[PDB]
Specification:
Belongs to the DOCK family. It comes from Homo sapiens (Human). Interacts with CRK and CRKL. Interacts (via N-terminus) with tensin TNS3 (via N-terminus); the interaction increases DOCK5 guanine nucleotide exchange activity towards Rac. Interacts with ELMO1. It is found in: Cytoplasm; Cell membrane; Cell projection, Podosome. The chain has 353 residues and is mainly α. Helix content is 27%, strand content 5%. Helix 11 packs antiparallel against helix 12. The protein is globular and about 70 Å long. It starts with 6 loop residues before the first helix and ends with a helix.
């Protein structure tokens, strides 16, 4: 219903700093023109699910799940291509909009006939074991340390208990700290001194071993359970990534290779999807950091992986071209660098402009 105008006072009381009713947002007239043309109309929500959004998303919520998760600000930012960008993109701190879709996962004991549901306990720690109090992991709008009291739906026990994850983190911290898949049961009994605790956790690999960051590609992650002493430190999980890569390329085809640890396969569903969305700035397809100095070969043209590379690196391609031209091998240098690097630049920076 309609009432008198009080936007500015409430806005500045929310922000608690001297702003203006439209100084925070410039209304981006051409950008919002194109946005109202394609996105800000019904179309992106048309493609959200099925025919439309109000009378069709509710049946989806009632049957299996609603798409209310996976906030849209990531996609709106990643397609709209706003103007007021900072220069602290790659160094300093990340955009803090990274969101990974934890589609499924459960703490099903298996031995017990009736599964007991436990919400995800985002226990944040370090390689050395730093506390990581309310100051570090929260601050982006995520207080999920207290997410507990899991009650099953009326029909199916399988669906997980995942929600929005928001982290305000820096490059040094993402280099250092680590997080675990803890599941502490919040039973009806008030006392938490019983033996209903988490039987195991799994750590999160923030950067791939070759130097690549988190990736959007589908890599379901499992957990490994056991005594608390073998996972209270980080070295044991540091040397055991517990990812899909080691199950085949490490010659770990036999599931009994681990002395005590057991993957979730044939134990619990634990389909932990990884999705480094387009809004992220650390996306990496081919490892450019070797391309700087320790480049084994010119495998970055035939296997260039011609994806975006939105220039958050700060001049990687042109500096590498400068060094390669200094090398003075032969024609293939120039032909490759031209026809791939300026290919990508003239195919992405055009939309950037």
């Amino acid at each position: 219903q309609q009432i008198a105008m009080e936007t500015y006072i409430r806005q500045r009381q929310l922000i608690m700093s001297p702003l203006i009713t439209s100084h925070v947002i410039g209304e981006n007239e051409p950008l919002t023109s194109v946005l109202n043309k394609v996105i800000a109309a019904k179309e992106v929500n048309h493609k959200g699910q099925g025919l439309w959004v109000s009378l069709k998303l509710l049946p989806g919520d009632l049957t299996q799940v609603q798409k209310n998760f996976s906030h849209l600000v990531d996609r709106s930012t990643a397609i709209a291509r706003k103007m007021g960008f900072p220069e602290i993109i790659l160094p300093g701190d990340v955009r803090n909009d990274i969101y990974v879709t934890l589609i499924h996962g459960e703490f099903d004991k298996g031995k017990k006939k009736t599964p007991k549901n436990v919400e995800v306990t985002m226990s944040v720690h370090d390689e050395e074991g730093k506390l990581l109090e309310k100051a570090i992991h929260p601050g982006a709008g995520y207080e999920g340390i207290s997410e507990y009291k899991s009650v099953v739906y009326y029909q199916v026990k399988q669906p997980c208990w995942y929600e929005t994850v928001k982290v305000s983190i820096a490059i040094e911290e993402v280099t250092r700290c680590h997080i675990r898949f803890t599941f502490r049961h919040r039973s009806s009994q008030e006392t938490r001194d019983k033996s209903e605790r988490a039987f195991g956790v799994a750590f999160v690999k923030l950067m791939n071993p070759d130097g690549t960051t988190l990736q959007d590609g589908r890599h379901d992650l499992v957990v490994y359970k056991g005594d608390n002493k073998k996972m209270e430190d980080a070295k044991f999980y540091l040397t055991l990534p517990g990812t899909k890569m080691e199950m085949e390329e490490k010659e770990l085809q036999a599931s009994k290779n681990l002395v005590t640890f057991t993957p979730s396969k044939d134990s619990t569903k634990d389909s932990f999807q990884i999705a480094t969305l387009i809004c992220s700035t650390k996306l990496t397809q081919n490892v450019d950091l070797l391309g700087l100095l320790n480049w084994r070969s010119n495998s970055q043209n035939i296997k260039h992986n011609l994806k975006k590379l939105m220039e958050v690196d700060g001049g990687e391609i042109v500096k590498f071209l400068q060094d390669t031209l200094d090398a003075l091998f032969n024609i293939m240098m120039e032909m490759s660098d031209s026809e791939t690097y300026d290919f990508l630049v003239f195919d992405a920076l055009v939309f950037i402009i």
